[PDB]
A paper describes a structure:
Central to the replication cycle of influenza viruses is the viral RNA-dependent RNA polymerase which transcribes and replicates the viral RNA genome. High-resolution structures of the complete viral polymerase from a number of human, avian and bat influenza A viruses, as well as influenza B, C, and D viruses have been determined. These structures have revealed that the polymerase is a highly flexible macromolecule that can assume a variety of distinct conformations, enabling the polymerase to perform both transcription and replication that require different initiation and termination mechanisms.
Five nanobodies, Nb8193, Nb8194, Nb8195, Nb8197, and Nb8208, were unresolved by cryo-EM, and as the C-terminal domains of PB2 are disordered in our datasets, we suspected that these nanobodies may bind to this region. To test this hypothesis, we purified proteins comprising either the cap-binding and mid-link domains (cap-mid-link, residues 250–538) or the 627 and NLS domains (627-NLS, residues 538–759). Four of the nanobodies bound to cap-mid-link causing a peak shift in size exclusion chromatography; only Nb8195 did not bind. Crystallisation of the cap-mid-link-nanobody complexes yielded crystals that diffracted to resolutions of 1.7 Å for the Nb8193 complex and 1.9 Å for the Nb8194 complex. The cap-mid-link-Nb8197 complex failed to produce diffraction quality crystals but, based on the similarity of its complementarity-determining regions (CDRs), Nb8197 likely binds at a similar position as Nb8193 and Nb8194.
Author numbering:
A (entry chain B): 1 to 120
B (entry chain A): 252 to 487, 490 to 532
The structure:
């Protein structure tokens, strides 16, 4: 029973920062690439970043390169996405997934990230 | 240096788009290249030495009379033929919406690697028939794009008959794309009828591979005929050849095959990280 549970999303203003976490359970987290995939309103699910098994190699979509950092804790079996300099076009549900390519073996449910100057 | 490649691509894309709507796109393309600086660097000086391979960049190089890769672009994917041969044969085909199209049928067995920015695939095809497509990518839309391009490129009758509207797609000069791109744009807008009529087949459970159904759901037992998704990843040797380029910025090799055109230049536009002066 693989389980992926994202958290840490929410409302922030353009340029702000967020730290997304993804708790993994039900498999040997250490032996799999992990990825983040996002879906903006009215669009399709789009790959964001991937991290190899021990975290020594990272991969980023060019739209988030230099602003997001992917990382993992193989002892606690948790994946992270550290988001700096957030933009309005970063608004989306962010999904934790198991594996490096589509179709990913498992998906989390996603946590909502809303980057906006007009909410409160 | 990677900042130079990135800004070179943005500059070439903007220059190619602007030239397409000119009365002399070729003459206007060249004067713009010679008039643009990237980070204080003459664009022509970069074009003469930078080895970045991108559709707009190579259209500029072709206009400058320089060599470019022998591979052709279709649907944004670089097609590199690894085996086989083909002879082009004019055929009148009937679309599913009862219009005629004169297409140049690739008659022969051929194997290609397709290298996209977000997807990679191995393609084997015969005359108007897709034999095998092994595709990899990091999201659904990226894999769907590759599958669509391969189905259209195969020129299968089932793909012609899956059209459901009149094909009136035009370039930015308000002008009909050639028949292959008419079909591509149609299914890029919506590929549900294409997928639903392509057909499925039982597949053998092979390590690191998975089937993909018409609704783009993964499956372990069936898959779109000839298509498989490699979760392991498909891993891609460029020959630079002399090309011709015409007043519509269509680039051809010395046997008349169109390698590049403005419609093969990405509509994407990042933000240049080095300043671009169009003096």
């Amino acid at each position: 029973q693989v389980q992926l549970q994202e958290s840490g999303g929410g409302l922030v203003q353009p340029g702000g920062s967020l730290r997304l976490s993804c708790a993994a359970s039900g498999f040997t987290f250490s032996n799999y690439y992990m990825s983040w995939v996002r879906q903006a309103p009215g669009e399709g699910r789009e790959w964001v970043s991937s991290i190899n098994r021990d975290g020594s190699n990272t991969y980023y979509a060019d739209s988030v390169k230099g602003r997001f950092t992917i990382a993992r804790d193989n002892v606690k079996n948790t994946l992270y996405l550290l988001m700096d300099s957030l933009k309005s076009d970063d608004t989306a549900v962010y999904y934790c997934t198991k594996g490096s390519n589509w179709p990913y073996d498992n998906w989390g449910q996603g946590t909502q990230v809303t980057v906006s100057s007009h909410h409160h | 240096n990677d900042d130079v490649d990135q800004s070179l691509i943005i500059a070439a894309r903007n220059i190619v788009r602007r030239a397409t709507v000119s009365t002399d796109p070729l003459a206007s393309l060249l004067e713009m290249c010679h008039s643009t600086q990237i980070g204080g660097i003459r664009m022509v000086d970069i074009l003469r030495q930078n080895p970045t391979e991108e559709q707009a960049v190579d259209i500029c190089k072709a206009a400058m009379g320089l060599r470019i890769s022998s591979s052709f672009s279709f649907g944004g994917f670089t097609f590199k033929r690894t085996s086989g041969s083909s002879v082009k044969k004019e055929e009148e085909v009937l679309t599913g919406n009862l219009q005629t199209l004169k297409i140049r049928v690739h008659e022969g067995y051929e194997e290609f690697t397709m290298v996209g920015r977000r997807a990679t695939a191995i393609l084997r095809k015969a005359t108007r028939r897709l034999i095998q497509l092994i595709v990899s990518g990091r999201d659904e839309q990226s894999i769907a794009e590759a599958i669509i391009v391969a189905m259209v490129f195969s020129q299968e009758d089932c793909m012609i008959k899956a059209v459901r509207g009149d094909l009136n797609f035009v370039n930015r000069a308000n002008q009909r794309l050639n028949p292959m791109h008419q079909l591509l744009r149609h299914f890029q807008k919506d590929a549900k009828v294409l997928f639903q009529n392509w057909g499925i087949e039982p597949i053998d459970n092979v390590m690191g591979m998975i089937g993909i159904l018409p609704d783009m759901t993964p499956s372990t037992e069936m898959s779109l005929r000839g298509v498989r998704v490699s979760k392991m990843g498909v891993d891609e040797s460029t020959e630079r050849v002399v090309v011709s380029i015409d007043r519509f910025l269509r680039v051809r090799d010395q046997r008349g095959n169109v390698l590049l055109s403005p419609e093969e230049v990405s509509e994407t536009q990042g933000t240049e990280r080095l300043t671009i002066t169009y003096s």
